[PDB]
Nucleic acid binder design. Structure first.
Ligand SMILES: [K+]
Ligand SMILES: [Mg+2]
Ligand SMILES: [Mg+2]
Ligand SMILES: [Mg+2]
Ligand SMILES: [Mg+2]
Ligand SMILES: [Mg+2]
Ligand SMILES: [Mg+2]
Ligand SMILES: [Mg+2]
Ligand SMILES: [Mg+2]
Lengths: 88, 80, 199, 134
RNA sequence: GAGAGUUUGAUCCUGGCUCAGGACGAACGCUGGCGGCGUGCCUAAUACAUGCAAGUCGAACGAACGGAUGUUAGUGGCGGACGGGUGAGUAACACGUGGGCAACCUGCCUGUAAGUUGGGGAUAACUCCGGGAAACCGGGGCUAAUACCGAAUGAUAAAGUGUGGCGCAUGCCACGCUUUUGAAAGAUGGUUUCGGCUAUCGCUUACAGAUGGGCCCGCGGUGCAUUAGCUAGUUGGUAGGGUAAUGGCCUACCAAGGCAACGAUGCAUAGCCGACCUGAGAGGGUGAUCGGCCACACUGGGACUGAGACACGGCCCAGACUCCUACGGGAGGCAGCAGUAGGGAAUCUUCCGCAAUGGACGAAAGUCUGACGGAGCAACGCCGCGUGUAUGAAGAAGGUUUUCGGAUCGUAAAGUACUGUUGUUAGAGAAGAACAAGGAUAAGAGUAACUGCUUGUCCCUUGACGGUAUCUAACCAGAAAGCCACGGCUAACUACGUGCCAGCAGCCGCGGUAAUACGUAGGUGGCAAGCGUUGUCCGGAUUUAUUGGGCGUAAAGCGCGCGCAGGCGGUCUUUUAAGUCUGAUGUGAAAGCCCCCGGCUUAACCGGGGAGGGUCAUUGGAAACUGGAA
């Protein structure tokens, strides 16, 4: 499959995550197709940056998210957005 | 459309059947000591009718493979 | 501290008062050891430049690896290399402690900030190697305020520089503005150092 | 030279020789063929032990051992320091270093690594000659 | 863009040798306190003791177990081709960069348009029989399906075609008619009236896309000519078959070409790159860790299965090697994670957990994952912190030395005051956690409507690390410093002992009875939880000189000519645009170097953003110079 998921980066006991487009097959920190955001769970508000237009695009092409990437999208208001574009 | 590669050169032989060999001859810069070197490189051109001859200036263009060696085609005969 | 040895012989070896003001040197300025009063020798280019380095890094009391990393880091800054290095070397926290004068010398300042008897920006910092910059306060932990070493070491203050402020009612001070090689003490050349590291 | 000369043949630098050729060769019993591998130290078995008369200007006797290394090369190794433990069929560890007094020696014996027992009675430079601290 | 020492009686040049810096996957010697981040078989792609690394679905199927849920050994589906390992081979479209495919494929993912109609025959499991210790094998009989095989209706699949618009020759795109083929399946759930209808998970056909692959091509990157010829399906063509697809890919027939001093062929070497180290830069060396691509899974070959393999933990066969046996016959491939032996100067625990991130299966709960998170060991490296702080004298005892007066170790100690980074003791105790599923509900599209689906908001929920970091108090200077050198090069000198002996040494060189060069003590210098030696790489080395050298005498002009090839080429006009120069577009991944911000008590480290980098390619311009032409 083609998936939207998390790329683990940073250091030990202090993770950071890039939000990435990739195949199911490729490795966790291997290659990708395009990276479109970042994530950090450490902070009291988790800090998310997403482009959202490429993200809508990859979803329209059928790149599905993970669970946590889905809920990041929904708490950013992007899954409502994508449903709204599926309405027509 | 997307476009293909085209080159110009000179003919060296005619013994082959419905084809020729076009030698391209370009100056280019020696990697370290900076001088210009005569780089040459011959290709096999697909001659649909055995038109061209030896001593002929010619233009070719690439295409699907047509033999073990050919990948090009005669496009024009610029100057005999 | 990092250097746990005696103090006076270094100043003697270097021909400059470091870790004091004539304390070590005004009696027998000559070099320590079997030799120094009996004879002296003429000292070479290498030795002079080296001795300049020594006068910096034993004035501040830090390892040579750390010292050279500080050199190379200061090398980035736009300006005169050794001036930038001297002012950053002053911009270390130990300096600011000793200039505020809650302790009588660099090594005591290091011990203070090692046990974390001070707090930058309100927060704790237990390292002598912190870098202060313009506007950062510093305090005495609100808990190490009455202790006799500080209470007796604040009785002395040779002169407060013009790039620091201090309120002893609070025991709170701060760096004002970065010096430029005239606010400081100026018993050094800042060029033989860069020679010695450039060869 | 002319540039055309330099194109017809580019330059060719010098072929560097090593101070320590025999450290820079490994062996595998299988292939029975030496394999170039940069190595700092090698262990060996003392074939012979003896003394040497060195060059002019000097005259003191110099202790050496003819060793067969792990890789099969036979090598003369100086035995630095006062007195030693070594004799025939003694195992020894070997570092590089050239005895300028002595013609056929190019390497030293690390003292204190193996059956080369440390020097007696030494107090200074102990890390060399391999005496513990007392 | 730093130089220093060393040839001589001395000098200048030439020329070599060494040194001062930086870096290591390092080893070794002496010593050794801690924390954070990292790194750790480079050698025998040598051999493997053992354990675990690929399973899953009961909402596909039948049987058995069971007091309706649940479980299973089997048939079936998907995945096993990912992830993980190593660098053997490989000098080539293998890799990088940039294009091309009108000459090509693509399960799972998304969307669009249609359709899941009716039947058949078996086969495991099971039960028996015989064999065999037993597994496990056969032979008979019974049996279910989302397993298999038929049909009707449906091809933007073929064949016959005709029209429109076109490209780059082979040709492409769109439309329509005729003829000939090609499909399927159910499961769960609700509702309804019982026929029906119907959500989701699946199935079949076509189309698009995305993603993943495949073929071709330009150029680029290694030494040897003490290796000059090589090739014979080899080169082209006409027919034919073959692949997902072009093509001597293969076959038959015809011709005899083709490549190559612009280094072919052959030998040895090597995975390639991003990038790493060094350097003023050009360049030199490397291809550990991280990412990409390639290749290979004891060696060799071959296929089947499948969307995808000629398959690490599949098959067959040959070969080597090994293991168990009841001696009849069976089984196997650690370059998966640990680990063992061996080799070696040398490199880790036979650890915990799927909490996280990601993958396989599943409707999902969940299961699986030596991927991955973590923890362990090694001072292997980078950073950080200590091993006390202050005060305290003409200056204790002692050591060294004494020019026997003193000088020095030395404010060091003692003594006094103070602190608790660390250590210890007792207490507290975060992040990381998002969710998923389930329970509620609010809106949608779609429904006869329900179920369901999608989305919004709440509730609930689960931590290996780990009672780890972190934080509070109490107690104690208490338990926490060693290595190298001291003639010059190069920082730092005395005493004794020895007597060309013992011994030192990177170069020069020391030691033959007054040794700052050996050994020791004191003192000093440089570093410091590391220091030094060895090995390797760059520089310095303009010592391979493109930048950037030279040949009268120092090394260096063939003994001289005739001359093929090549290199280089007088003055002017026109023409071009091969080279050159130039504007635009596209790309040169992330990480790394560089710059700017932020976060870890700073640092190391980590994040964000930008920049750079190509003899890069296409397209469009100039004609001064080189080149081509008249
Ligand atoms: K062929
Ligand atoms: Mg190899
Ligand atoms: Mg250079
Ligand atoms: Mg397999
Ligand atoms: Mg295996
Ligand atoms: Mg292993
Ligand atoms: Mg003597
Ligand atoms: Mg001569
Ligand atoms: Mg990049």
């Amino acid at each position: 499959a083609v998936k939207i998921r998390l790329k683990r980066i940073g250091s030990k006991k202090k993770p950071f995550y890039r939000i990435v487009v990739a195949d199911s097959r490729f490795p966790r920190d291997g290659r990708s197709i395009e990276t479109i955001g970042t994530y950090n769970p450490l902070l009291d508000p988790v800090e998310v940056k997403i482009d959202e237009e490429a993200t809508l695009k990859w979803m329209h092409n059928g790149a599905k998210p993970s669970d946590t990437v889905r809920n990041l999208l929904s708490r950013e208001g992007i899954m409502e957005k994508f449903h709204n574009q599926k309405l027509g | 459309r997307n476009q293909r590669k085209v080159y110009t050169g000179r003919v060296v032989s005619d013994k082959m059947d419905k084809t020729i060999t076009v030698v391209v001859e370009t100056y280019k810069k020696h990697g370290l000591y900076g001088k210009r070197v005569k780089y040459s490189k011959k290709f096999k051109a697909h001659d649909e009718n055995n038109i061209a001859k030896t001593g002929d200036v010619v233009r070719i263009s690439e295409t699907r493979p047509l033999s073990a060696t050919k990948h090009f085609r005669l496009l024009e005969v610029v100057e005999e | 501290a990092r250097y746990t040895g005696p103090s006076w012989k270094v100043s003697r070896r270097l021909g400059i008062s470091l870790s004091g003001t004539g304390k070590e040197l005004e009696r027998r300025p000559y070099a320590p050891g079997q030799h120094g009063p009996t004879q002296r020798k003429k000292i070479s280019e290498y030795g002079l430049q080296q001795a300049e380095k020594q006068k910096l890094r034993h004035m501040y009391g830090l390892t040579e690896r750390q010292f050279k990393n500080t050199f190379n880091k200061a090398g980035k800054l736009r300006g005169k290399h050794g001036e930038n290095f001297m002012i950053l070397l002053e911009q270390r926290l130990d300096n600011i402690v000793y200039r505020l004068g809650l302790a009588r010398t660099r090594r005591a300042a290091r011990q203070l900030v090692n046990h974390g008897h001070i707090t930058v920006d309100g927060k704790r910092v237990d390292i002598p190697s912190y870098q202060v910059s313009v506007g950062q306060v510093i305090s005495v932990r609100e808990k190490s305020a009455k202790n006799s070493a500080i209470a007796e070491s604040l009785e002395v203050s040779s002169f407060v520089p013009e790039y620091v402020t201090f309120d002893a009612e609070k025991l709170t001070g701060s760096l004002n503005r970065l010096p430029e090689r005239s606010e400081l003490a100026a018993e050094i050349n800042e060029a033989f150092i860069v020679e010695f590291y450039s060869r | 030279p002319t540039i055309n000369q330099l194109v017809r043949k580019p330059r060719q630098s010098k072929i560097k020789k090593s101070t320590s050729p025999a450290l820079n060769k490994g062996l595998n019993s299988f292939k029975r063929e030496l394999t170039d591998v940069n190595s700092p130290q090698k262990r060996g078995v003392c074939t012979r032990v003896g003394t040497m008369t060195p060059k002019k200007p000097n005259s003191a006797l110099r202790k050496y051992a003819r060793v067969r290394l792990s890789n099969g090369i036979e090598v003369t190794a100086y035995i630095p320091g006062i007195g030693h433990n070594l004799q025939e069929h003694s195992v020894v560890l070997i570092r590089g270093g050239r005895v300028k007094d002595l013609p056929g020696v190019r390497y030293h014996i690390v003292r204190g690594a193996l059956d080369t027992a440390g020097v007696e009675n030494r107090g200074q430079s102990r890390s060399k000659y391999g005496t513990k601290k007392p």
